[PDB]
Amino acid sequence: SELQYLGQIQHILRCGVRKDDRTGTGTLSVFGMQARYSLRDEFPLLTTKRVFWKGVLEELLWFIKGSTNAKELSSKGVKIWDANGSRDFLDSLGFSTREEGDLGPVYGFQWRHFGAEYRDMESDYSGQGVDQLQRVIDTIKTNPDDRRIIMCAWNPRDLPLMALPPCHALCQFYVVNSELSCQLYQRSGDMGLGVPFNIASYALLTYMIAHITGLKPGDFIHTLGDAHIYLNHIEPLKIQLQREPRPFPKLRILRKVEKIDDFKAEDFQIEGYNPHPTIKMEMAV
Amino acid sequence: PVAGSELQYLGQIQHILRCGVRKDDRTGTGTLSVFGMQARYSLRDEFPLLTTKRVFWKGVLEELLWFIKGSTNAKELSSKGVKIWDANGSRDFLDSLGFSTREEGDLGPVYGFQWRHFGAEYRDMESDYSGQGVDQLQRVIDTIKTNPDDRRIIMCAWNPRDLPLMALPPCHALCQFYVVNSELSCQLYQRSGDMGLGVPFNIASYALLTYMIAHITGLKPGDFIHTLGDAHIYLNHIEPLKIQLQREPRPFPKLRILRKVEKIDDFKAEDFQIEGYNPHPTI
């Protein structure tokens, strides 16, 4: 359960090697990890530290709508991408002609219009590109034993146009005994700030697709590439590691939804979530 | 001591036999399947060519060189004695997918096309794609030489746009490279792995690729992390694998690169020598 995440934190603190990165700060890094989180009658929202669930829900709906505009997500109260869409950051990447908030062809664009010619964030891409999100839902409805149910956000062609290359680069879905499972490949995971957020993110997505396809949520397999702890996250994570985890909350979908695009934020309710106080961990940039 | 050796593969075989659920697949046969597995194989002064069963090393070497050249022609690999792709390029098979206008052997935009010209408009196997697409294979080599701490060293063969034009969607869809202490490591994401026939072949394949890139970039090979999606054992493979599972593995061989190669395209099959490979008889 949650001990698997805490075990990964401990393993990086005890066996992780020092490795500098692009942000100038240091990390303790381990390459190649895998954890398994059950989705059966529980939702893996971490209890040893309060997780920004409101951000998790809005960002996933922000992904599903295909939006690549940081202002669209920030206006919902979730400012997690405002640093990567700011004028100073876009200029540091050479995007002087882009309006502030244009993250480029990122998660939302690749999920819904993979292969389309990206112009800007306010363009209409209807009918353009590959709709991977609907393709995986239809494949599950008709051929649940398929071993190719993959949604990939890593686009080498669109890569130089992205404000930040996708961290959760590829995910695969798996069905057996009417149970829907999902494995995520995260090329680089910020164990302090991003990883707890990403775990609930793809657990919520599996709950959405299971509800649409009438399946029961199974497991979420979290595979990491460069699993790293930033140096300014060492002391906060040592505090979290000394906390006793509480029971995971449960996720209730309030109404019967037929299409993935009809999900609203008011359709989801987290019950029984009593986390420890939040731990401030600053984003590296 | 287990460590990152062949015992991990045998352990995965045992775990699927004991905890794998029955799951039908696209083929007429069944599988015992487990979703989500990960193993670690050391590349330090040894090469993970499995010893509990003889591995088609000639196929491993020729197929990787066939990928590096950007070829999507099954006949080009078949002419080297490796007929593993001949079924997916046959005339009967191409017609069953709707590719009636394709010459026999045209596998479509597959690994060789996606590794070297990702995003280019695919025509056929005899086309010239010079200057078109993203050369991921050269990009990862350049990134390792100049920015080894980069967390984006990724070569991805999964192309949703080119997917309906492929004779077979990529099983090993994405791999990532990692550098620390002058050691090059590689993690592979395999969406579905045949533990009996494919997985031992794929382990040596990407371990050999790590040896090639380490030789060019002047780094030491480290570990190869094998991540699996649908790790499955075919039902007709259960009894042969139970026999292999009762065998004691022998020490891994060593891979020797005979000459100093500067570019990934200059590697020939005669540049590699496997020494000390003593596998068990085939089952």
Ligand SMILES: Nc1nc2[nH]cc(Cc3ccc(C(=O)Nc4cc(C(=O)O)ccc4C(=O)O)cc3)c2c(=O)[nH]1
């Ligand atoms: N280095 C580095 N760069 C990154 N770029 C984007 C991410 C992903 C990502 C950022 C932030 C969060 C979060 O939880 N944010 C907040 C939580 C709270 C709260 O818990 O009260 C209040 C405010 C925020 C906020 O950011 O407005 C979650 C995922 C990321 C990373 O993880 N690492």
Ligand SMILES: O=c1ccn([C@H]2C[C@H](O)[C@@H](COP(=O)(O)O)O2)c(=O)[nH]1
């Ligand atoms: O969803 C996300 C977004 C970002 N990050 C973290 C991983 C890295 O610490 C940083 C991205 O930096 P690069 O690996 O691209 O250098 O953000 C995550 O873990 N998950």
Ligand SMILES: O=c1ccn([C@H]2C[C@H](O)[C@@H](COP(=O)(O)O)O2)c(=O)[nH]1
């Ligand atoms: O490099 C490869 C190619 C194929 N396979 C096996 C996995 C599956 O058993 C089958 C492919 O079938 P699909 O997963 O596409 O259904 O071939 C491998 O293990 N490795």
